[PDB]
Design an enzyme around this catalytic site. Structure first.
Site, PDB file in Angstrom:
ATOM      1  N   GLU A   1      -4.801   4.262  -8.523  1.00 11.94           N
ATOM      2  CA  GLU A   1      -5.595   5.230  -7.777  1.00 11.94           C
ATOM      3  C   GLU A   1      -5.628   6.472  -8.652  1.00 11.94           C
ATOM      4  OE1 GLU A   1      -6.656   4.304  -4.423  1.00 11.94           O
ATOM      5  OE2 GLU A   1      -8.201   5.778  -4.933  1.00 11.94           O
TER       6      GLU A   1
ATOM      7  N   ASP B   1      -0.507   6.080  -7.317  1.00  5.68           N
ATOM      8  CA  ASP B   1      -1.246   7.307  -7.016  1.00  5.68           C
ATOM      9  C   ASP B   1      -0.967   8.329  -8.114  1.00  5.68           C
ATOM     10  OD1 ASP B   1      -2.942   7.345  -4.650  1.00  5.68           O
ATOM     11  OD2 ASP B   1      -1.140   6.856  -3.518  1.00  5.68           O
TER      12      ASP B   1
ATOM     13  N   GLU C   1       0.493  -0.133  -5.653  1.00  4.72           N
ATOM     14  CA  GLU C   1      -0.439   0.974  -5.826  1.00  4.72           C
ATOM     15  C   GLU C   1       0.206   2.129  -6.583  1.00  4.72           C
ATOM     16  OE1 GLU C   1      -3.018   3.789  -2.877  1.00  4.72           O
ATOM     17  OE2 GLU C   1      -3.427   1.640  -2.750  1.00  4.72           O
TER      18      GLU C   1
ATOM     19  N   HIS D   1       0.849  -1.185   0.000  1.00  5.54           N
ATOM     20  CA  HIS D   1       0.000   0.000   0.000  1.00  5.54           C
ATOM     21  C   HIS D   1       0.884   1.234   0.000  1.00  5.54           C
ATOM     22  CE1 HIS D   1      -1.164   3.193   2.934  1.00  5.54           C
ATOM     23  NE2 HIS D   1      -2.127   3.378   2.050  1.00  5.54           N
ATOM     24  N   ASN D   2       0.701   2.090  -1.011  1.00  6.63           N
ATOM     25  CA  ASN D   2       1.497   3.296  -1.255  1.00  6.63           C
ATOM     26  C   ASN D   2       2.986   2.955  -1.304  1.00  6.63           C
ATOM     27  OD1 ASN D   2      -0.795   4.870  -1.382  1.00  6.63           O
ATOM     28  ND2 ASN D   2      -0.089   6.377   0.119  1.00  6.63           N
TER      29      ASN D   2
ATOM     30  N   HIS E   1       1.873  11.385  -3.345  1.00  5.16           N
ATOM     31  CA  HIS E   1       0.808  11.467  -2.358  1.00  5.16           C
ATOM     32  C   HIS E   1       0.202  12.865  -2.401  1.00  5.16           C
ATOM     33  CE1 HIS E   1      -0.571  10.588   2.048  1.00  5.16           C
ATOM     34  NE2 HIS E   1      -1.490  10.250   1.162  1.00  5.16           N
TER      35      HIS E   1
END
Ligand SMILES: [Ca+2]
Lengths: 331, 743, 55, 333, 44
Positions: free
Chosen positions: B397, B348, B346, B316-317, B363
């Site tokens: 995402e 983003d 992931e 995650h991230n 982020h």
């Protein structure tokens, strides 16, 4: 297909038993009448400084005055061994040099390294550019002002012609990286050591391998000549100098000692032949007696791996050059 | 499975150029690899031999993937079209964040492809990581033998630095075997053999904890053991009774004769079929006396079950290297996650600038560093199937709203990944209501895209799907979660749902018996809450009980929850796909995930673990304790255990205390034991995660790995395990059971 | 592999039929050279320091 | 049908022996002595603790001068101690670490050794004087007859008398079935006993070189055997926790020093100077003084951590020294 | 293994013809040896 290997095995067995039947005496036994030499002390007189990186090779001038020192930082300084005056500072266009040479006359200087080509200078400018090696260059020696012999890491030696840039005779017959080669004092037939633990003897006329020599268990980093052209001493990477014969095709003496485990770099005989000198990885240089197989002195002044060692033509001085960018002339 | 062999081009050696970027240094070295496949040694710039531990190499990359020099002096030196085909970089380090690059440019053609491929084949071996105690003791010998000084000798500072606990016993045990023992002296490497090393190890520390084992079996006055006294030690103490006695038969005496012939030095007992007291101490660290069998470590799993019936490694991230609020996003973590065994990363994505349309990855609204999307997709296409050829799930995402960049990134994923993308469904599984998902055997070497089709942080306010980016999403299609009784009525197994941790812990406690039934058809995915700005990790064993496949965890921080996640996925070939137990993937056989009694259909077990002793555990005189945790179902979770702290009395401490008793484990095929040795004062030393469904019983050597599952060389433990079969307000009642599993 | 397999059996055959004088005679000549040329070898004998080119 | 006659002639002579034994069986030592006083509470004390080894200790021996003692370790390093002022007067390294025995000269000049390497390395008081080879098994125990003779006991079911100058097997003692584990010489220095593994000690004469009195009785190994100080009795410590006491003139077993609460075997027995206390060391880290005439415990010597593998009294009874498997050696008085 | 049974009964026959000193006199000799030597034991 196997019958070829069987007749080759029988043919080399005819070398084996003829070597055994020719081994009737031993030089470790014949020299027992000879009185020893004992203590030999050499001392640093001239410390030629001026480099910037590690020194890889050197060669003496024929009149035993000037010497060229090829450093890793792309520089071939030609010194004066009497007054310590930098006569030249030749910048090469490649960093990795491995060898340098000098001339019988005294006007040309060759070089070479990882760029697979042998740059010949003139005493400054590149005169000729000798391309044709498929691997890197290890060691090069002049014959006269017009001819050179080179040893490459693609399992061959070559004999060039300077004025035309053409490979005259291409000595092949090895199967390993030719790390060093040495020339007879009359320049008729030379030797070559490889990473196969096998010295070979080539000639400059017919281009053929006349004699082969075995004995080691590792690479061969140095070969010199006995000063009459009848013997040679293959210094190797298992700390064993040897001595061979051009006539008997047999190894004669071995220079081994415990508390000497490191491999060796550069050997050289003396002007008479009674001595021998070697350079080791433990930063030292041990004069061996060539007949009684005992040490005679220690040349310990260097702080790093002794990479090159050379004795003059009048037998007066030795000169060492190590990886600490310094040369020392002993006397 | 194959033992690590070193081909004859790596032993003989090859010439390279070790260049460097920061120091702008360069040298011509010759790389060699010792014939055991242990180290990588080359002669340094001042004749002192350097080494690189080959079990620390994360990746070797060559060709256009290798690092190029960024300084024009080094570029002019090296020769800077196909000259960059001779580059090679070997990376190494303890954790995914802190790696150290070693750059090697070859001087000969074709000696870089083989020299990188045969190092990555050696650094990713199973039998070199699960090696026995004898192999890890011959590795510390080769580390002393290969690191010679300028003369060619094993120095004496090295043998005082390796066994750096005390200094009187080391020098005394050197003087008592006929060697040199001062502070500035040296030993020749032909008078320091393997037997003169082990006869120094035996004089180094005293071993009464093997004297007790030999007293328990009957070595009374004779200085040997017979054949029957060893066969009826193996088949009585070193035999796990859970296996079926027909296809795993006990030891015949002809095999114990082979063991005696292999492990014993004395020739008197070798002809009368007897084994001495050194031939038994060499047996306890043998390759047959392993803590885990070699079927619990290779790819031996039914890989044809549907994709919703597997635990899947996930992150995650991934791009960050620090906390979520003031970190620094990097592209290297996409390499060091997908090489480490992950299978779901992931992205983003964000909207580009009016200078030019390029989507970048960061982020949102957090002042981090921005990396671009094309380099990240290049990294993912590079290091995808290098460790395990099982399908990655790219969890986008999306945040781009301009229709130009939505078509830009639809061609990025089609030109970079090429044929490894899945754009059309398979021939057997169409996208209809009522079909099961395709197996990981049928999606071998493909890349699946997760994006929208036509307290959560920045994952809630997404940007709606366009007609160009949503041509890729077919099998893993995220929807919005309505209810389990709403998702059950739809009967569409090609969807999923993504719960945040705080919203997953509100249906974990509320209704888990519908949750397990939901995770039998479709997927799930849990990412930690947005308030964990220090990148802490929740426990994945909370949600592995209810059946959740893609439990995603922060990879940059290594706490207990990440050590368990990196240790539980080492088994099954490091492929990142662990099968569910049978009552979490059958349609009819339901069970309660919060039960306190055993369940009809699942064979229970019982486990007793007693910590005998352990050797070479520290580098200074300080006491050692050992924690024996256990994770699993919330009735099998018991982390309270700890031994007493020893006094640092020798190289090896011995613990004289009662066993640890795990009397009932309800679901053994899901639980996992954690033996972690610490110092007195909170310092960490080593740990190991062992599955309970395949652990062995008897006197065994546990070889402690470090904080990120890499094998330590010298430290180990000796434990006695006994594993046998078992012999016979609701939102508070279900939230007081998880008080141990939460923390 | 076959032309080399004829080249090697040629190379050993041209080596085997040579003259091999004994190691006693070779060591006798090698020993006789050293003291015959040791009068003019400035490594064993010390140097007159006025005529020393480096002092 | 010729071997059945030889087997029945074998067993009928065993019957004739066992009838002649019970023909002499009249009473027992406790029934005879049952009006004598007890000894009482023998409370001892660790005099010195001789630290200095690095492995287990398999054997030791006291000098005849009652001052010095040798103690063969397991790293391959004998040390000769000075029991009064604790200084290590000698420290001799070996060629093989696995050492199972040592010895000392009655003169005080020759220390022997042995172990798993089949040889007995007689040293001089330092360097190797001889290397007595010829055995085909490990060398369990070896004792000095004089400065010229040595007698060994090896694990190939044979004892042997040797010659320290020529290095040849002078007389050979054969007739056991299991591995010979221990050995002790009588005070008249003309006969020894050999406690092999098959529950049987024998009586050999060194000059005629053959056995003359063979005892049975145990059910396990015999790890120790040591003479009474009159040359008429001994005590065979065993593995089933039963110290016995046999008699040479009667050819029978007299006492059995067994007990409840003890199931651990013996690793060393020894009498005292008076022949009153049978000091015996057990494999459960504790030594227990057995009163030899009443078969009851009288003193507890428990100060060692691992098992006590060697014990020996001196030749004036002033001290008793134990050495255990935890690299320590204590002298008890 | 034929002469082994003869070699066994040879040593058995040598074991047979010895002297038989009684256990009461032997134990009395043991007690007389201990009572005459219990004065020079420093342990007691
Ligand atoms: Ca996110």
């Amino acid at each position: 297909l196997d019958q070829l290997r069987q007749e080759a095995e029988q043919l080399k067995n005819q070398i084996r038993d003829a070597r055994k039947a020719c081994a009737d005496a031993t030089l470790s036994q014949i020299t027992n009448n000879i009185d020893p030499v004992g203590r030999i002390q050499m001392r640093t007189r001239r410390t030629l400084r001026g480099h910037l990186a590690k020194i890889y090779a050197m060669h003496w001038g024929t009149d035993s005055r000037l010497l060229v020192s090829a450093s890793q930082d792309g520089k071939l300084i030609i010194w004066d061994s009497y007054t310590t005056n930098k006569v030249h500072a030749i910048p090469l266009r490649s960093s990795w040099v491995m060898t340098c040479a000098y001339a019988p006359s005294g006007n040309y200087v060759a070089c070479g390294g990882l760029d697979n080509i042998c740059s010949i200078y003139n005493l400054v400018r590149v005169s000729r550019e000798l391309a044709g090696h498929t691997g890197y260059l290890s060691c090069c020696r002049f014959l006269d002002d017009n001819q050179i012999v080179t040893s490459s890491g693609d399992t061959t030696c070559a004999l060039w012609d300077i004025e035309t840039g053409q490979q005259t005779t291409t000595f092949t017959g090895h199967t390993g990286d030719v790390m060093s080669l040495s020339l007879a004092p009359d320049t008729r037939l030379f030797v070559s050591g490889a990473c196969d633990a096998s010295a070979k003897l080539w000639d400059v006329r017919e281009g053929m391998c006349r004699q082969t020599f075995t004995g080691h268990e590792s690479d061969i980093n140095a070969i010199c000549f006995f000063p009459n052209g009848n013997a040679f001493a293959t210094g190797s990477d298992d700390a064993t100098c040897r001595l061979f014969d051009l006539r008997a095709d047999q190894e004669l003496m071995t220079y081994s000692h415990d508390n000497i485990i490191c491999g060796i770099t550069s050997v050289s005989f003396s002007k008479s032949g009674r001595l021998l000198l070697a350079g080791y990885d433990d930063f030292n240089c041990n004069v061996w007696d060539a007949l009684k197989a005992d040490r005679a002195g220690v040349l310990a002044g260097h702080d790093n791996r002794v990479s090159c060692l050379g004795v003059t033509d009048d037998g007066m001085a030795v000169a060492t050059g190590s990886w600490d960018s310094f040369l020392k002339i002993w006397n | 499975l194959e033992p690590p062999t070193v081909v004859e081009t790596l032993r003989r050696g090859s010439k390279f150029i070790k260049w460097d970027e920061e120091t702008s240094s360069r040298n011509l070295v010759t790389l060699r690899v010792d014939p055991n496949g242990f180290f990588l040694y080359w002669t340094g710039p001042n004749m002192e031999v350097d080494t690189l531990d080959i079990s620390s190499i994360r990746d070797t990359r060559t060709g256009r993937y290798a690092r190029l020099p960024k300084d024009p002096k080094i570029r002019e030196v090296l020769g800077f079209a196909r000259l960059e085909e001779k580059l090679m970089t070997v990376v190494s380090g303890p954790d995914p964040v802190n790696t150290v690059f070693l750059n090697f440019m070859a001087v000969q053609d074709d000696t870089a492809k083989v020299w990188s491929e045969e190092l990555f084949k050696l650094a990713m071996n199973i039998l070199a990581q699960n090696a026995s105690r004898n192999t890890f003791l011959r590795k510390a010998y080769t580390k002393l033998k290969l690191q010679v000084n300028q003369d060619g000798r094993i120095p004496v500072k090295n043998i005082l630095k390796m066994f750096s606990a005390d200094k009187k016993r080391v020098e005394t045990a050197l003087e008592s075997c006929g060697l040199k023992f001062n502070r500035s002296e040296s030993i020749r490497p032909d008078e320091f053999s393997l037997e003169i090393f082990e006869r120094f190890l035996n004089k180094l520390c005293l071993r009464p904890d093997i004297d007790k084992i030999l007293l328990e079996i009957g070595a009374k006055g004779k200085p040997y053991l017979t054949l029957e006294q060893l066969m009826d030690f193996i088949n009585q103490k070193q035999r796990d009774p859970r296996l079926n006695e027909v296809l795993y038969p006990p030891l015949r005496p002809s095999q114990a004769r082979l063991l005696i012939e292999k492990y014993e030095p004395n020739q008197q007992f070798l002809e009368r079929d007897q084994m001495s007291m050194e031939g038994f101490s060499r047996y306890l660290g043998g390759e047959e006396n392993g803590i885990l069998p070699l079927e619990a470590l290779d790819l031996s799993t039914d890989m044809t079950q549907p994709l919703s019936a597997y635990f899947i490694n996930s992150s995650h991230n991934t791009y960050l290297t620090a906390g979520q609020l003031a970190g620094t996003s990097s592209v290297e973590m996409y390499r060091q996650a997908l090489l480490w065994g992950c299978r779901c990363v992931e992205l983003d994505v964000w909207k580009g600038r009016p200078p030019e349309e390029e989507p970048f990855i960061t982020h949102g609204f957090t002042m981090t560093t921005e990396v671009p999307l094309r380099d990240v997709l290049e990294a993912i296409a590079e290091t995808a199937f290098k460790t395990s050829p099982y399908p990655v799930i790219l969890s986008f995402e999306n945040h781009v709203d301009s229709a130009k960049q939505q078509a830009k990134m639809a061609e990025y994923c089609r030109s970079i990944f090429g044929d490894a993308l899945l754009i059309e469904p398979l021939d057997k599984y169409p996208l209809a209501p009522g079909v099961p998902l395709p197996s990981p055997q049928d999606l071998m070497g493909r890349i699946l895209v997760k994006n929208k089709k036509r307290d959560e942080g920045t994952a809630s306010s997404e940007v709606n799907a366009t007609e160009e980016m949503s041509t890729l999403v077919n099998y893993i299609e995220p929807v919005k979660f309505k209810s389990f009784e709403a998702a059950r009525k739809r009967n569409k197994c090609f969807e999923m749902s993504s719960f945040v941790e705080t919203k997953a812990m509100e249906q974990l406690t509320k209704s888990p018996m519908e949750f397990v039934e939901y995770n039998k058809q479709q997927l799930s995915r849990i990412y930690p809450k947005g308030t964990r700005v220090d990148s802490s990790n929740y426990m994945p064993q909370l949600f592995w009980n209810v059946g959740c496949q893609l439990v995603a965890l922060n990879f940059q921080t290594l706490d207990v929850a990440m050590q368990l996640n990196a240790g539980v996925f080492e088994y099954n070939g490091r492929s990142g796909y662990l099968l569910k137990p049978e009552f979490m993937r059958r349609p009819d056989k339901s069970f309660d995930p919060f039960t306190e009694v055993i369940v009809d259909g699942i064979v229970a077990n019982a486990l007793r673990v007693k910590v005998i002793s352990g050797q070479f555990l520290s580098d200074r005189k300080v006491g050692i304790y050992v924690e024996v945790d256990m994770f699993g179902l919330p009735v099998d979770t018991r982390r309270k255990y700890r031994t007493r702290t020893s006094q640092g009395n020798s190289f090896n401490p011995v613990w004289d205390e009662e066993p640890f008793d795990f009397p009932k484990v309800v679901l053994p095929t899901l639980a996992s034991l954690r033996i972690a040795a610490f110092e007195e004062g909170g310092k960490f030393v080593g740990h190991r995660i062992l599955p309970v469904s395949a652990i062995r019983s008897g006197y065994h050597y546990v070889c402690l790995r470090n904080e990120a599952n890499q094998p330590l060389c010298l430290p180990a433990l000796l434990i006695y395990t006994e594993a046998s079969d078992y012999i016979p307000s609701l939102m508070d009642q279900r939230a007081r059971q998880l008080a141990a599993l939460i923390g | 592999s076959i032309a080399q397999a004829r080249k090697l059996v040629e190379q050993l055959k041209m080596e085997a039929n040579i003259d091999r004088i004994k190691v006693s005679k070779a060591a006798a000549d090698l020993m006789a050279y050293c003291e015959a040329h040791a009068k003019e070898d400035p490594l064993l004998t010390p140097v007159p320091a006025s005529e020393n080119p480096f002092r």
